[PDB]
């Protein structure tokens, strides 16, 4: 509530030269900001040194602090420290309280230095993913025709492997490959629970595909649409999405889309992978027509960001639902990134509601500002059960 109220009254300064922003960046020993040097007292209930005076901010390696978006985020998120302090005041036994923004930076309390290379990204975390969108029924189509051989085949394999990491045990996924003939990359033949074992099996299967043949989009999309209509087996009964991993084509196949999804009940996400000059027209048309999105993956460095962005599209119905789509959800027992042991995290999305009193913008208000999270240790639950 406080984050929404504060972000509603934002001016969006285009320059931060005269009035810098004051924040404590983590993982540290540029114009636009001034850093904070904390005391970092050694405290119990945590394995490290923490400071209760302010909140630490973590920004990923490939995201540059000092940009206009990041600076505006560090401006409007500075009002969360008071609520962090009040929440601790009402409960001294409270663990990390974190706000992970859609920009990429996470502001967490209490302040503590970050833990080689740092590949941590907040938007890939399971607690962020479960609150960014509802459970899903992903179906991955892979173009394994002659043209994808070489760099744009290992890139597709890595993209699929990274995309599978964005699923949980409440989602259902399957991977299929087509080259004039559609088939499953493994011995599942239907949607699986996408747990650790099924995801590992699918990753091993997709790591062993070879490129040959001629693309036929009609057969592959027919296979995907018939796979998404099984109803013989357990599923999620939620968001149905076909994620297409190809390079380019000269066919859009209006017939298949008209026959299968006439009422547009299934989203279609299309990815263009590799460095090539093939025609991207149909690839973007199929994304636009079916409530989907179009993404380009030209190298390895673009794999991580592009494989996580589709959750912005799936979050539109949640934000347009209103306050009814605001419930606290608890993740599976996982290991804390800040070396705290086994924890579960509560989750609550934050909506962007600037100027909603007059109801006139409605354009960027279809996306979430971020996700709040609070950590509960299993030691507390063990303590409550002598």
């Amino acid at each position: 509530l406080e984050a929404e109220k504060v972000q509603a009254a934002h001016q969006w300064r285009e320059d931060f030269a005269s009035n810098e922003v004051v924040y404590y960046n983590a993982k540290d020993d540029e114009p636009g900001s001034q850093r904070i040097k904390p005391v970092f007292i050694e405290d119990a209930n945590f394995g490290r040194q923490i400071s209760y005076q302010h909140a630490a901010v973590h920004i990923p390696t490939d995201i540059y602090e000092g940009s206009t978006i990041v600076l505006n985020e560090l401006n409007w998120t500075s009002a969360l420290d008071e609520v962090f302090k009040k929440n601790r005041e009402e409960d001294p036994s409270l663990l990390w309280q974190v706000f992970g923004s859609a920009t990429g930076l996470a502001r967490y309390y209490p302040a503590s230095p970050w833990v080689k290379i740092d590949l941590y990204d907040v938007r890939r975390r399971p607690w962020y993913i479960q609150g960014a969108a509802s459970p899903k029924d992903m179906l991955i189509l892979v173009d394994v025709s002659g043209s994808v051989s070489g760099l744009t085949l290992k890139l597709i394999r890595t993209s699929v492997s990274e995309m599978l990491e964005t699923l949980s045990d409440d989602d259902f996924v399957n991977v299929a490959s087509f080259n004039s003939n559609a088939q499953d990359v493994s011995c599942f033949q239907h949607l699986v629970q996408a747990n650790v074992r099924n995801k590992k099996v699918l990753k091993d299967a997709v790591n062993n595909i070879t490129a040959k043949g001629i693309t036929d989009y009609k057969k592959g999309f027919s296979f995907a649409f018939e796979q998404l209509l099984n109803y013989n087996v357990s599923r999620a009964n939620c968001n149905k999405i076909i994620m297409l991993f190809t390079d380019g084509g000269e066919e859009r196949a209006q017939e298949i889309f008209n026959k299968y999804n006439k009422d547009k009940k299934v989203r279609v996400f299309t990815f263009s992978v590799g460095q090539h000059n093939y025609d991207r027209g149909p690839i973007q048309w199929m994304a636009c027509e079916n409530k989907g999105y179009y993404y380009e993956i030209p190298s390895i460095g673009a794999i991580r960001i592009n494989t996580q962005e589709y959750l912005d599209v799936l979050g539109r119905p949640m934000v347009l639902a209103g306050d009814k789509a605001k419930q606290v959800q608890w993740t599976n027992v996982y290991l804390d990134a800040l070396e705290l042991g086994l924890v579960i995290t509560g989750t609550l999305p934050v909506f962007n509601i600037t100027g909603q009193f007059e109801n006139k913008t409605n354009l960027k208000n279809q996306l979430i500002l971020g996700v709040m999270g609070v950590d509960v240790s299993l030691e507390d639950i063990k303590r409550l059960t002598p």
């Binding site: 459970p135 973007q284 994304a287 999105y293 179009y294 539109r316 347009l320 354009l363």
Partner: peptide, 23 residues
């Protein structure tokens, strides 16, 4: 047992922006 919350196919969804027209 799966979650009893489903949010999709909203009538007010914009979906007027892709990655093609922008770039």
């Amino acid at each position: 047992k799966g979650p009893d919350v489903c949010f999709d196919n909203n009538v007010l969804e914009d979906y007027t922006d892709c990655g093609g027209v922008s770039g």
